[PDB]
Amino acid sequence: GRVRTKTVKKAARVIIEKYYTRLGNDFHTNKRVCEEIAIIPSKKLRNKIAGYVTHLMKRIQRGPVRGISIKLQEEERERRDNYVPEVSALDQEIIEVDPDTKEMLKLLDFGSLSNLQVTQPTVGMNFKTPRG
Amino acid sequence: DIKLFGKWSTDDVQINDISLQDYIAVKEKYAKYLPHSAGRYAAKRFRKAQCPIVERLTNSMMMHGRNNGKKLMTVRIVKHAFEIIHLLTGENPLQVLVNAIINSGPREDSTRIGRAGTVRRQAVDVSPLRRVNQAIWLLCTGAREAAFRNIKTIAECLADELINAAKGSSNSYAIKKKDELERVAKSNR
Amino acid sequence: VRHVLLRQGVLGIKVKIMLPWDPTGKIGPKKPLPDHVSIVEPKDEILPTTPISEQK
Amino acid sequence: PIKLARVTKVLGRTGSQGQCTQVRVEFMDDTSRSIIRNVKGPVREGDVLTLLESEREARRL
Amino acid sequence: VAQIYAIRQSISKALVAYYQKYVDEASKKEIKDILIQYDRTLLVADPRRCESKKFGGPGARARYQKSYR
Amino acid sequence: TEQMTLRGTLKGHNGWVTQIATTPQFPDMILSASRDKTIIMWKLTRDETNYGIPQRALRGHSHFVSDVVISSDGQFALSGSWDGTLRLWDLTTGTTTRRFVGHTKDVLSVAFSSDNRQIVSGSRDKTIKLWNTLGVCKYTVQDESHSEWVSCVRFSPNSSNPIIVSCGWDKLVKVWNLANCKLKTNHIGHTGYLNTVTVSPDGSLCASGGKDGQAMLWDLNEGKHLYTLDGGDIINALCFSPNRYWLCAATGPSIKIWDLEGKIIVDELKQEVISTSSKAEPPQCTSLAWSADGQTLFAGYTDNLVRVWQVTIG
RNA sequence: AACGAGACUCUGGCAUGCUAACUAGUUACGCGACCGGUCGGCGUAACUUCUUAGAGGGACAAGUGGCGU
Questions:
Q1: Domains in chain D: how many in total?
Q2: CA 20 to 30 Å from D50, out of A102, B72, B114, D7?
Q3: Where, per the database record, does this protein carry N6-acetyllysine (chain B)?
């Protein structure tokens, strides 16, 4: 079959990671830039690097890939990670406590908290999985 | 427009069985002027279904060792047979070829299972492509075996079995093997 | 491959040397191995911020 | 009687030496009978099989 | 046989090139589709040539008969 | 008001239609270079079942023909390809007459002069080659042309002082003084490489697009970034329009025709009604062509065909 | 990380594109011969399709559609 060995895949991964701006989807202009960037002993390896690159550039539009790391995604993930909402998800006016949680807060002298709305506790003591 | 050997046309040839329709060639666009085509039919599986079955019969005509390369020998054997067929019947001689290939191939074989010397077979189906493959084999070895030490030539011996397989007679070597290949097949079932 | 004649008999000596690269200013072969792909280290593209029309 | 058939999907290739393909066989009488049969020879999907006893079952030989 | 299949290929490839060089492309297409529809070996060369013999046998693939004990 | 409609496709190629050239002297022949090594003379019947028929294929190239151009009269052509050659053609009998060798990389584009005697070409050798009408090169450029390839070279068809301009893959539109071989103006304004340069018919406004997707146009007399036209994906090609005063810009799968002084995208130009093969990429639009009257717009696509666009005045 | 595998080297296949051919030719022109035909018969020129052999191209699972966490 047609499996690409570690030489083609290692070279293709570094040449994506360093020169992502020049590479696109055409295998032919990928081959014309993979022979100007790199010094490959010639064509039958040059067309195999440029073909895995042409299969690897289509794999970058659909999301990240678990090897290489390129700085058009890794700025978008950075701006996705520095994302705070306007009002936090911990600012709830009605938070729900059990009966016994309120007793722990009264031990911690937090029975004067106004936002707590004690729920009705569960009527059945049914939590274990039915063994057998 | 396209007549085999420039004389026999293909428009009135009518395959009977639905089992062999997609596999047996010419009716429509496999019409060739000659059985010699020199094409790469063995390059993939199932590709030889799309070759004209006149070339199939020509190719299996040259089986034994002293005739193994001779294609221009066997195409004139088939051409001279297609005169004797037309004389002895009076119709188009391609309808009798598909009548012989429809009739001659078995429809239930036995697959061999046992030990070294022990035979306990079992009956299975027959794929229609193996039916086409084993039709032409029985026809051609019947023509080969009954022309060996005999004054009859190969063109007469091919034609006098290529009609006897169309008529379903049991004097032809082909139908004599098909009914026994199904008789020993039913005997296990 | 060479021979030695000792006291007791003959020895053979086989010596293989894998030579290195560095195109021949006196040493080694010119071309690299057929699987050694080298990649030119990119000088980074400087970031184009505002359209400057440099009429020179 | 004799019954004419069709091929839905080829399942796998069984037999002592792998000579038998095992095939999921539809009938041609608009029947919902999807019998499994043992066919000897080259088969692809969309064939037209021809059986003699149309009530047999697929084993592994 | 190999020169018959070379003559009929060059007749076809000559008429197609004449109709391309001194007639229009449309007539070249209406020739080429019938020539391709009959048999593609009237325009495209057959690229298979004889393999080389190897020691150990009488030809390319076949090997000499071996014996035991 | 003015829309863009389909009348048919010109299906005669096998590779990507790389670049189209049209002539105003002949309203019937279209010349479209391609990536199946052949340039095809078209003939426009404009009936219902064939808008265009091929007439005479021009075959001299051993690789992908990149850029074709027709002379000031409808009898000479000029082209280049990715084998480092330029083939001067003849439209009457359909052959070559001159062959321009001297490049060491892929000839990317070739521009034709108004006086039909100055032949310029840009290659992947980071060099620009200036020719006669015969074949001896006059001056080859190593005046720090670009640090990388030269993707498109175009003349300026102005009644004023002419100029020669050439973009590149180093984000730069360099302006050159013809017959004196010297720089005039740099434009450090593009992110990512470029693909094309077109020049307006007055000879004042050049356009230039690339991987940024934004047609950043400049001025040829003083060098101002006038309008920042926006697009989606890559700009494969750009061309102007003399009558309607527009700027034909290329999206990937579609075409963006723009009002220039108004900066309104007026039409979208695409055709996808299929759904079982739309899981992949839609085909790009590689080239653009504007004829004499401007009623017709031709585009070079990746389904090996050329689509015609009609300006329905409504 | 190293070797072996693969890459690699020779060979087959393609090129009316490049380089050139009296120790390979084709086409054309006269001559000659026998009935516009036939010349592997004779000499000039246009040129490399056929013949040679060099560089460089060309095929990568690249394209489309299915199946694959």
A1: 1
A2: B114
A3: 32
